[PDB]
Swiss-Prot record:
Gene that encodes it: Polr2A
Assembly with partners or alone: Component of the RNA polymerase II (Pol II) complex consisting of 12 subunits.
Species whose genome carries this gene: Drosophila melanogaster (Fruit fly)
Function in brief: DNA-dependent RNA polymerase catalyzes the transcription of DNA into RNA using the four ribonucleoside triphosphates as substrates. Largest and catalytic component of RNA polymerase II which synthesizes mRNA precursors and many functional non-coding RNAs. Forms the polymerase active center together with the second largest subunit. Pol II is the central component of the basal RNA polymerase II transcription machinery. It is composed of mobile elements that move relative to each other.
Parent-protein residues present: 448 to 496 of 1887
Binding residues annotated for Mg(2+) 2, in chain numbering: 40, 42
Localization annotation: Nucleus
Domain comment as written in the entry: The C-terminal domain (CTD) serves as a platform for assembly of factors that regulate transcription initiation, elongation, termination and mRNA processing.
Residues binding Mg(2+) 1: 40, 42, 44
PTMs per UniProt: The tandem 7 residues repeats in the C-terminal domain (CTD) can be highly phosphorylated. The phosphorylation activates Pol II. Phosphorylation occurs mainly at residues 'Ser-2' and 'Ser-5' of the heptapeptide repeat. The phosphorylation state is believed to result from the balanced action of site-specific CTD kinases and phosphatase, and a 'CTD code' that specifies the position of Pol II within the transcription cycle has been proposed.
Miscellaneous field: The binding of ribonucleoside triphosphate to the RNA polymerase II transcribing complex probably involves a two-step mechanism. The initial binding seems to occur at the entry (E) site and involves a magnesium ion temporarily coordinated by three conserved aspartate residues of the two largest RNA Pol II subunits. The ribonucleoside triphosphate is transferred by a rotation to the nucleotide addition (A) site for pairing with the template DNA. The catalytic A site involves three conserved aspartate residues of the RNA Pol II largest subunit which permanently coordinate a second magnesium ion.
Family membership: Belongs to the RNA polymerase beta' chain family.
Protein name: DNA-directed RNA polymerase II subunit RPB1
Length: 49
DNA sequence: TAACCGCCAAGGGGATTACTCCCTAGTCTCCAGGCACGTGTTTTTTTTTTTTTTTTTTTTTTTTTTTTTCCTTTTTTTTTTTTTTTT
């Protein structure tokens, strides 16, 4: 799947990922994604395609 | 108080006559500046293209996501039906 955070300022702000199914209603990913996505986990809404 | 007149005295130079001489009047003859005709090269006028600043027009303003609220006409003129009064 395609994983994208807005605003996309550069090439590295949307990746491809492999789906792992987890019960809870949030998106779960590795911490090292926080630097290319410029994410802060403080209410960041983010898209999957 | 000396102008003016009368009287007298003295002298100076313009008029007159004659001789001379020399400069111009007149007449050829050659030739050259004075003048009639043509025109010019600067001067002004007009176009021509650019320049330079001012003014006007137009277009622009990071992305994604989630909730309400209000409104989505309105007065103003014309028409048409209804009701009341009169003979």
């Amino acid at each position: 799947v395609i994983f994208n955070r807005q605003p996309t300022l550069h090439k590295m702000s949307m990746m491809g990922h492999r789906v792992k199914v987890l019960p809870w209603s949030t998106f779960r990913m590795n911490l090292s994604c926080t630097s290319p996505y410029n994410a802060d986990f403080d209410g960041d809404e983010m898209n999957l395609h």
